[PDB]
Structures are given as structure tokens and as C-alpha cells.
Amino acid sequence: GPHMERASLIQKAKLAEQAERYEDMAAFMKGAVEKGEELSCEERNLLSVAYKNVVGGQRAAWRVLSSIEQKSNEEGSAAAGPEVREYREKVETELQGVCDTVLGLLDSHLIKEAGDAESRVFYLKMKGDYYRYLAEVATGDDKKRIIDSARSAYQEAMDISKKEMPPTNPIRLGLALNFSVFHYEIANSPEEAISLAKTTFDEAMADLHTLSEDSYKDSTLIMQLLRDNLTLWTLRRSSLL
Amino acid sequence: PHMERASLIQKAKLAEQAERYEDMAAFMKGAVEKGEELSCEERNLLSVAYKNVVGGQRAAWRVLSSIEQKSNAGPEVREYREKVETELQGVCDTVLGLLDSHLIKEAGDAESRVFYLKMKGDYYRYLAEVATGDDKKRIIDSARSAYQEAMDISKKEMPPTNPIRLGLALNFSVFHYEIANSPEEAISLAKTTFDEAMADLHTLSEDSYKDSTLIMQLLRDNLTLWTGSRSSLL
């Protein structure tokens, strides 16, 4: 509608977050991004949380529908009613529209305009994530092209993070976590997934002592997710010390 | 594109499983507009869909109102609270429209008749929660009138343990307390409802028992909160 002030959009995104109105939150943040200014660390998290919640609800719904559709097609003497697939396809189109919106914001404003490496890695990781979400629902020749786009974004983010960030950096840790999930679940490379998660965990472990107590908590929380994934993917009980 | 009555009902059940309540409501609104009566299962689908949609709006409106009250600088809170309120009002008006245009009829079974009139009381009550001035008074009168008509039918045609009858009495007592500022009517209604249902609990099948006692617990919880209030084993 009429031109809003960037500061009013950010304030409304924070109000929408408190009200658990994630679609409104995303729309406020999209408007703020389109103002052309860089996002602060707090503002990047608002953009990320808004779209993560929106796409997370779509991905959860798509998974339920896809399971119902699969079971009714496989089982019994008949196929599922056409309604399941039509509804699953409505949810999928809507999911694709949100990923395309995020990828559009990243390519039009956020990746090119970023100052620091911290924010460049954050946006390139986000690009990998939203191509990964698109890959989860893709099937044909489109699937291969989307998987290449996700790998390419994650790899560029990895290259930068290795050059500019310490191994304990939470953004660097979170990126390596998501990239390993991509290798395992999307690119069907469990070996790459395990070696990336092992290397990430080990290199971060070696510098844990150098961290301030608040940095330590941020880092170990992500290292835990790497370790959990490794246990799940890949052995004696532990007594004290 | 399968959008006939039976396809709309099937998609509403899928939307429920996927926790897509706005899709669920839109499917059920479409099914209602087909002009046919809703079965017991279908009425529950309509109710669950709009309850979840309006519940998210009411929770959001309460947060924004809370922030606005503490803040009273900054015009954004009120503008945003007003956007959420208008949207909430639009959903209540859609539900009230469906009830008046298609669902509320003089000739059906008592359960369905009480069910729709209770839903009318509920959505006027949600409108009353955000209403101010002249409009508030008319909305409160409309809610009381719908709830009262639902109460007359339920006392004449349903047993005291009937879950619809229990749920109606619960919501009407909440209306007396919160909306009409009559805590005495609220308390008296909740006490009578609980006591009369308690007397017949022994007659119920195990599935009926669970449905009835679960609503009776909400009446009792409300009574404890409204009136005031140790015990060892026995």
C-alpha cells in the first residue's frame, strides 16, 4: 500500500513475533528488506524466524499429506481419492511460493548488499536452506538443478566461513550442520555428511577453551546437534571422568 | 480439480490432520454453502476449523492489547492491534453469516439446533471481547439471546450429561462472568449444571463418561477460580 517507514516495519515484525503471527512477521520483514538497507544481526534473525515458521508449517503439512497419499495408493484394492494429491499439490505450490520469495529477497537485496562475512555466510546458508526445502518436494530434472543450486550456495558459504570465521563461530557451526543434513538427506552422500560433521565438531572442540562463557553456550548447543546427527548416522558406556 | 461437497469434506479432514486450520475452514465454508445439512461429524469439522482460526486471532489480539495497555507512545501497536481486530471481526461475521444463512433452522434434531445456536452465542461472544461503545451492547444482547434460545431447547430435549448441553452451559456461564458482568448468574449456572450432570454420571457408557466429565472439570475449574476454594487420601 502506501510507503511505510522501515522502523515501523521492524517494530511491527517484533509485535507479530510476540503475537505468533508469522505470516504477518514475514510480510513486515520482506517490506523492511525491500527498503534497501542492510539488516542488523537482530533483524536477520527476525527475517529468518518469520520465514522458518511459515515454511516449517508448510513442510510439516506436506509430509502428513504425502504419507497419507502414499499409504492409500499402496494399500488395498484401489488408489487414494484424487483429493489427497490435489490438496498435497496446493500445499506444495504454496511452500514453493514462500521459498521463491525468500530466494528472491536473498538474490535481489541481501547477498549482494551484505557488508561482513558473518552476514554473507548467514544469507548464503539461508539460500542453501530454501533450495534444500524446494529439493524436498521436487521430483524430475528440476530436482537435480535445485540440488545443485543448494550445494553451490552451501559450498560458497563454507568457503567464506573457513576463511573468515573461527571454527567455534555459531553461524559457521550452524551452516556445517545444515550442509551435512543436505549431504545425507538430499544428495544421498552419507559419507560426506559424516566427514563434514566429524571435522566441524573436532575443529570447534579444540578451541572451546578460548571462549567466553556466553560464546561457549552458543557453540556447544550446535556442536550437540552435530554429535546427535553423527550418533544417528554412524560406543562404550561412560562413568564419571 | 475436485471441489464438490464430498471432496470439500474430505479435504477438510486432510487439512485437520495437516493442522492447516484456515484451509480446513475454507473447505467447510464451501461445504456449508452447498446448502445441505451437516452431519454430526461435519458440524465438528466446521467448529474445530473456525475455533482454531479465531483462537489464534484472539490470542494475538490479547498480546497486542496487553502491550498497548502497558505502552499507555508508538502508533504501531494500536494500528497492528486494529488490523488483527478487523481480521478477527471478519472471521466472526463469516461464521455468523454461515449460521444465519444456512445452518440455523427451526426443523432439525435438538442436538444440531442447540449446537448452532451455541456457536452463534460463541461468535457474538468473541465479537463482544473486542467491541466498544454502542456496538458492544447490541453484540452482548445478540449473544445472550442465542445462548438463551439454545438453553431452552437443551433443558427440554437433552439429558443433563449431554456433552453439547454441558458445553453450552459452560460457555453461557463464561459469557455471564466475562462479558455481561454477572458473576452471580455465571456461578449459579455452573453450579446447577455440574450438580445435575453429577447425579446421572453412573448411567453413562465409558466413552460418554469421558466426554461428560471432561466438560464438568472445566465447570468445576471455573467455579474454583470464581468462588475461591487440603485433602489427604479419601
Swiss-Prot record, chain A:
The keyword Cytoplasm applies. Ubiquitinated. Ubiquitination by RFFL induces proteasomal degradation and indirectly regulates p53/TP53 activation. It comes from the Eukaryota. Its main location: cytoplasm. The record marks 59, 132 as: Interaction with phosphoserine on interacting protein. SMART domains: 14_3_3 (SM00101). Present mainly in tissues enriched in stratified squamous keratinizing epithelium. GO terms for molecular function: cadherin binding; identical protein binding; phosphoserine residue binding; protein kinase binding; protein kinase C inhibitor activity; protein sequestering activity. Keywords: Cytoplasm, Nucleus, Phosphoprotein, Secreted, Ubl conjugation. GO terms for biological process: cAMP/PKA signal transduction; establishment of skin barrier; intrinsic apoptotic signaling pathway in response to DNA damage; keratinization; keratinocyte development; keratinocyte proliferation; negative regulation of innate immune response; negative regulation of keratinocyte proliferation. It is found in: Cytoplasm; Nucleus; Secreted. The keyword Phosphoprotein applies. The modification Phosphoserine is found at residues 8, 77. Pfam families: 14-3-3 (PF00244). One of its GO terms (cellular component) is extracellular space. Homodimer. Interacts with KRT17 and SAMSN1. Found in a complex with XPO7, EIF4A1, ARHGAP1, VPS26A, VPS29 and VPS35. Interacts with GAB2. Interacts with SRPK2. Interacts with COPS6. Interacts with COP1; this interaction leads to proteasomal degradation. Interacts with the 'Thr-369' phosphorylated form of DAPK2. Interacts with PI4KB. Interacts with SLITRK1. Interacts with LRRK2; this interaction is dependent on LRRK2 phosphorylation. Belongs to the 14-3-3 family. Adapter protein implicated in the regulation of a large spectrum of both general and specialized signaling pathways. Binds to a large number of partners, usually by recognition of a phosphoserine or phosphothreonine motif. Binding generally results in the modulation of the activity of the binding partner. Promotes cytosolic retention of GBP1 GTPase by binding to phosphorylated GBP1, thereby inhibiting the innate immune response. Also acts as a TP53/p53-regulated inhibitor of G2/M progression. This is 14-3-3 protein sigma. It comes from Homo sapiens (Human). The lineage of its organism: Eukaryota, Metazoa, Chordata, Craniata, Vertebrata.
